[PDB]
Amino acid sequence: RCLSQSRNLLKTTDDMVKTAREKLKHYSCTDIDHEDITRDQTSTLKTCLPLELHKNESCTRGSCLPPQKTSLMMTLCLGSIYEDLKMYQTEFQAINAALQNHNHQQIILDKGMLVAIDELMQSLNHPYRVKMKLCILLHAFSTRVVTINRVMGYLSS
Amino acid sequence: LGPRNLSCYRVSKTDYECSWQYDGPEDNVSHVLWCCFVPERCRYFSSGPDRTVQFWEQDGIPVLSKVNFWVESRLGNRTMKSQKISQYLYNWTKTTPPLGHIKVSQSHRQLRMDWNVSEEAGAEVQFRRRMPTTNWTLGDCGPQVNMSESCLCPSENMAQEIQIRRRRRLSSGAPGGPWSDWSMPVCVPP
Amino acid sequence: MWELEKDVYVVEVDWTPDAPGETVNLTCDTPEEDDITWTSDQRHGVIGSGKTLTITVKEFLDAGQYTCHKGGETLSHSHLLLHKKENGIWSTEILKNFKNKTFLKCEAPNYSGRFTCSWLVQRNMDLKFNIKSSSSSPDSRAVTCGMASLSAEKVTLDQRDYEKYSVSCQEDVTCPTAEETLPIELALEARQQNKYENYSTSFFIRDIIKPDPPKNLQMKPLKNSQVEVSWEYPDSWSTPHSYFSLKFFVRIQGAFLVEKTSTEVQCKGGNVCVQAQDRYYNSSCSKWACVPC
Amino acid sequence: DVCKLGTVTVQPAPVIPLGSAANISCSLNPKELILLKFVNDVLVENLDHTGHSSTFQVTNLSLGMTLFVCKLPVPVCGVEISVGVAPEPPQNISCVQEGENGTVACSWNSGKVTYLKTNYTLQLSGPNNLTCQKQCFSDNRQNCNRLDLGINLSPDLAESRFIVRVTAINDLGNSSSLPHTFTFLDIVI
Ligand SMILES: *[C@@H]1O[C@H](CO)[C@@H](O[C@@H]2O[C@H](CO)[C@@H](O[C@@H]3O[C@H](CO)[C@@H](O)[C@H](O[C@H]4O[C@H](CO)[C@@H](O)[C@H](O)[C@@H]4O)[C@@H]3O)[C@H](O)[C@H]2NC(C)=O)[C@H](O)[C@H]1NC(C)=O
Ligand SMILES: *[C@@H]1O[C@H](CO)[C@@H](O)[C@H](O)[C@H]1NC(C)=O
Ligand SMILES: *[C@@H]1O[C@H](CO)[C@@H](O)[C@H](O)[C@H]1NC(C)=O
Ligand SMILES: *[C@@H]1O[C@H](CO)[C@@H](O)[C@H](O)[C@H]1NC(C)=O
Ligand SMILES: *[C@@H]1O[C@H](CO)[C@@H](O)[C@H](O)[C@H]1NC(C)=O
Incomplete structure (x- = not known):
């Protein structure tokens, strides 16, 4: 299922962030400066929770949700995950294009996580500023992919 | 005869202490000391036959102003007199022995000792060593960069027991307090 | 100098011997034509006159309980604490x-x-x-x-x-x-x-998680000197366990991690033990639970 | 943006010729200031209104690209500066053709390595109104000392002289060479 791709994405993200942790340690990665990319299509923080902790209602369609576990908030969860991944992939392609065009080789964005995002996409629908922006984007994407792994593991298993 | 060589000093950041060495027989002696200053106001502390007194910040004693100390011991119907000392107590600091377990490593005819200490100043380390058949031998260790400190000692064909201490020092090289007591003994085989 | 609570003030006194202290104006909160006397607990005798007293706070002797008295009665009481400051760095001694x-x-x-x-x-x-x-x-x-x-x-x-x-x-x-x-x-x-x-x-509440040891660690004998070690999720851990997951560590008394609730390994003749940890973050490990060989 | 607390600027340009001075202007947006220098990702030298905006001077900067970051603690923002030299004019430009009737390729000398991004333009020209031009990019990864004209030539020519030129361009200036001349009766080999 999509769970294996999700674990592969987690492993690749962990590998590339651990490499960036010494390669860009002096810029901002050493404080943490937790800022993310989206605040308004960020429905994942309110919908991507198991249907045992939803006490109150105050908190595309997808094609990888199993039919043994069909719900109403889960489709919104998967759609919001898709939209968040769309924003993340667009920003990562833009920053990769802006990063190869200069003469500094002190950072590499390996394509393993990019193709991992791409297959997760296809399964789910049928100067100096750039490197510190990359650091903060990674610091948000780590928690994002952990949340995605949690909800998809709950949904599948 | 009588109390002599009074020394009030600061054991820790929040605690202070005072000690004196008494000469003569001990049959019915009672040791009390008088603390005088200008707020005169001569408070007194009692400790019985013991020869050390412990207090701290909030005991109503001045630690930032000039303070006079003296001692009255007891003998029946007669008293014994002591000298007067006039000093401040905050910046006359007695430091601590080396912190916890120290690390000892052996090289060619040499022993290197390392530890971690919570003082950033360079304390003149003076150590002493003793093979368990004879008495002790003393020696200065040497300056070091200061966090962590290092000490060196020549080896011995038999085992030995070695102790080590510190004292606080100002930037002028002046002695900034009394000698700290020795740490726990360190045993090393040949 | 600020009001921590009602009639309780705290001042910032530098702990340098030669440095001067702070000046505090303390006023009893009831007006009377008769002159107001002031008393302290750390000092003896009358220390102040009038409804407003100026105190040069320099040390712990100049702090504590201050009371305003008129006639043969009291009117109010006000405490005064200190906050040590040393070389620009506030003290941490309690x-x-x-x-x-x-x-x-x-x-x-x-x-x-x-x-x-x-x-x-x-x-x-x-x-x-x-x-x-x-x-x-x-x-x-x-x-x-x-x-x-x-x-x-x-x-x-x-x-x-x-x-x-x-x-x-x-x-x-x-x-x-x-x-x-x-x-x-x-x-x-x-x-x-x-x-x-x-x-x-x-x-955060995610980098301070310390789970509990497995509750039912037991052991099954199998063929050719190889055994089975089985455990269970702690009952205090959050539910469901599919969404909140764990990775367990097994060591025979250097350890190898298992993501399933059952492992197989040959024994050495001593107590085999498992611990629990959150799978995703590097949270604190649990305390071990054990079962004799 | 990302450098939200303030900004850092350099004059006259981020690209500087070798052995010059540098000025760094660190300004802080409303609601002290020091400079930290990193050479090859190694911290090397540690450099009211004083906490609002300031300027710093750097003399005899290190060789190659380096980093200057402004510090309050939190990094307010930073900048990277590359130092190099203008390209030296080329030398010894020879052109050979491989094949019976094929394409000539030409070699030259790049001189000292420019230490920065640089490109070279090869220009072939000749009478009866014939010409061709292309580029080659020298950087830390790819080097340019050989190039292929990519144009097939004719065997009927035995009387004219053709011209090969090379120009060197980067952000620190331009450089050219001699418009060398060769004959098309002995290139073939
Ligand atoms: C942690 O401990 C620190 C002490 O190390 C503590 O800092 C102190 O906080 C108090 C209040 O938060 C500060 O007192 C204020 O100081 C300002 C500037 O001098 C004054 O303008 C304030 O005036 C108030 O009171 C007046 C009379 O009641 C009012 O008219 C006025 O409107 C204000 O309400 C007030 O005196 C104090 O200066 C600091 N100490 C410093 C900065 O050294 C801190 O609050 C503690 N808590 C936290 C969460 O940090
Ligand atoms: C401590 O402070 C007093 C105050 O003036 C000063 O005279 C003295 O030199 C300082 N140092 C020592 C070791 O007493
Ligand atoms: C002192 O503390 C350091 C912390 O980095 C530690 O690595 C070392 O083992 C400690 N002990 C020594 C130096 O004896
Ligand atoms: C830097 O600024 C000072 C004055 O602000 C000026 O004199 C100096 O020439 C400047 N440096 C450069 C390299 O222009
Ligand atoms: C080289 O650059 C200078 C800079 O002003 C310019 O004047 C000149 O025309 C340029 N020459 C060529 C051949 O590009």
Whole structure:
């Protein structure tokens, strides 16, 4: 299922962030400066929770949700995950294009996580500023992919 | 005869202490000391036959102003007199022995000792060593960069027991307090 | 110089011997034509005249209880604490740092929103602690901390006993979220009978998780000198276990991790043991549970 | 943006010729200031209104690209500066053709390595109105000392002289060479 791709994405993200942790340690990665990319299509923080902790209602369609576990908030969860991944992939392609065009080789964005995002996409629908922006984007994407792994593991298993 | 060589000093950041060495027989002696200053106001502390007194910040004693100390011991119907000392107590600091377990490593005819200490100043380390058949031998260790400190000692064909201490020092090289007591003994085989 | 509570003021006194202290104007809160006398607990005799008194605070002798008296009665009382400042760095002497050079150690057993914050005092006379959520924004996450209580687990540091205080806190939200964004920030107001110290900390509830040991560790014999070690998820861990997952560590008495609740390995003739840890983050490991070979 | 607390600027340009001075202007948006220098990702030298905006001077900067970051603690913002030299004019430009009737390729000398991004333009020209031009990019990864004209030539020519030129362009200036001349009766080999 999509769970294996999700674990592969987690492993690749962990590998590339651990490499960036010494390669860009002096810029901002050493404080943490937790800022993310989206605040308004960020429905994942309110919908991507198991249907045992939803006490109150105050908190595309997808094609990888199993039919043994069909719900109403889960489709919104998967759609919001898709939209968040769309924003993340667009920003990562833009920053990769802006990063190869200069003469500094002190950072590499390996394509393993990019193709991992791409297959997760296809399964789910049928100067100096750039490197510190990359650091903060990674610091948000780590928690994002952990949340995605949690909800998809709950949904599948 | 009588109390002599009074020394009030600061054991820790929040605690202070005072000690004196008494000469003569001990049959019915009672040791009390008088603390005088200008707020005169001569408070007194009692400790019985013991020869050390412990207090701290909030005991109503001045630690930032000039303070006079003296001692009255007891003998029946007669008293014994002591000298007067006039000093401040905050910046006359007695430091601590080396912190916890120290690390000892052996090289060619040499022993290197390392530890971690919570003082950033360079304390003149003076150590002493003793093979368990004879008495002790003393020696200065040497300056070091200061966090962590290092000490060196020549080896011995038999085992030995070695102790080590510190004292606080100002930037002028002046002695900034009394000698700290020795740490726990360190045993090393040949 | 600020008002901690009603008729309780605290001043910032530099702990340099030659440096001068601060000037405090204290006024009894009831007007009378008769001159108002002032008394202190750290000093004897009448110290002030009139309804307003000026105090040159320099040391702990010039602090404590100040009372305004008229005739043969009192009118009001006002306390006065100190806050030591040394070389520009505020003192930290009531509490003792842990092994990792931190003062407040907070730990949570699961993702339920409740945790326990503990510290190590140095002396045990007249301590009045207070822990509260130091808010700095209208959207800051708020906790409702309880009363601090003594714990009988006297820890050993510097080969020396240190007595331990603990408090239980619980974060409350309108409806729970999927992840944590703004960290919990906490402030502690420690005081020792005249001395005031302020401590602070900030953490997430995901990097302080310390799970519980497995509850039913047993053992099945199998063929050719190879055995089976089975365990169970702790009952205090958050539910369901498919969404909150764990990775277990197994060591025979260097260890290998298992993601399933059952493993097979040959024994050496000693007690085999498992521990639990959160699968995703590098949270603190659990205490081991064991079963004899 | 990302450098939200303030900004850092350099004059006259981020690209500087070798052995010059540098000025760094660190300004802080409303609601002290020091400079930190990193050479090859190694911290090398540690450099009211004083906390609002300031300027710093750097003399005899290190060789190659380096980093200057402004510090309050939190990094307010930073900048990277590359130092190099203008390209030296080329030398010894020879052109050979491989095949019976094929394409000539030409070699030259790049001189000292420019230490920065640089490109070279090869221009072939000749009478009866014939010409061709292309580029080659020299950087830390790819080097340019050989190039292929990519144009097939004719065997009927035995009387004219053709011209090969090379120009060197980067952000620190331009450089050219001699418009060398060769004959098309002995290139073939
Ligand atoms: C942690 O401990 C520190 C002490 O180390 C503590 O900092 C102090 O906070 C108080 C109040 O938060 C500050 O007192 C204020 O100082 C300002 C500037 O001098 C004054 O303008 C304030 O005046 C108030 O009171 C007046 C009379 O009641 C009112 O008319 C006025 O409107 C204000 O309400 C007030 O005196 C104090 O200066 C600092 N100490 C410093 C900065 O050294 C801190 O609050 C503790 N808690 C936290 C969460 O940090
Ligand atoms: C301590 O402070 C007093 C105050 O003036 C000063 O005279 C003295 O030199 C200082 N140092 C020592 C070691 O007493
Ligand atoms: C002192 O502390 C350091 C912390 O980096 C530690 O690595 C070392 O083992 C400690 N002990 C020594 C130097 O004896
Ligand atoms: C830097 O600024 C100073 C004055 O602000 C000026 O004299 C100096 O020439 C400047 N440096 C350069 C390299 O222009
Ligand atoms: C080289 O650059 C200078 C800079 O002004 C310009 O004047 C000149 O025309 C340029 N020459 C060529 C051949 O590009």
